[PDB]
Design a protein around this ligand. Sequence first.
Ligand SMILES: [Ca+2]
Lengths: 56, 222
Amino acid sequence: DFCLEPPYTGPCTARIIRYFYNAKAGLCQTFVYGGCRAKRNNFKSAEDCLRTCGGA
Amino acid sequence: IVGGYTCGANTVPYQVSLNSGYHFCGGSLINSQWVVSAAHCYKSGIQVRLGEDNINVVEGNEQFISASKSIVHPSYNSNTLNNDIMLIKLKSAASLSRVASISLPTSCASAGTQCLISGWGNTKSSGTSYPDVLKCLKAPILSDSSCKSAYPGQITSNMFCAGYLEGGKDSCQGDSGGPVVCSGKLQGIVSWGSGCAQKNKPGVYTKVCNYVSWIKQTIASN
Ligand SMILES: [Ca+2]
């Protein structure tokens, strides 16, 4: 389950704010994404995040 | 920029901040209407901020201009990060001492060349600390061999390493797309690395000298 994976910033050095499902908190939180090599637990909005991972 | 120093208000006139509701990448002004940055900094709704020092406070020397076009290199590979370069056309031309363009290189720089890297990225190797003002770093260009030894099978002909093998001084999240200027010419674009300021893991930059033709022609036909 990719929704249970920790957020992945990646090697690139941008500072792009994305969302990830935090199964421990039971909610989608923000994190800094570097701009490349995103894993699946990386969403552009909280709504996308909840729709895909909500309740995982 | 980890291990750097405060540049000083408007001492790096060609440095721009790419804003999408917040600063997410840097860029360099190459003429009154064009900016060069990294391809991985591609985002919709980009606003370019010129003449910035403290990115959180309006100080009076700024010019915020929206991008009208964003051209990512046709061969950019998001997996290998090869050809990590992008051109952004400003909706209107900037008014050029605090805002100025940087010259494109006539030739490639050699290992050992000292360059100035700048940005508003994270200043901590372990942790998070985003600055208000522009940070600067002098780092030498490293040899292709050591670069390739640090990142086995990841360095292409279009990338170069710069920094210190000891670690402690490096570019970091939020610096992407920014300039690496050596001898007054734009030689690199902040691109990627393994963590920030780690020992034996210098930063990797887009080698600008290989794209000068593409840049000049692309600017002219758009
Ligand atoms: Ca400002």
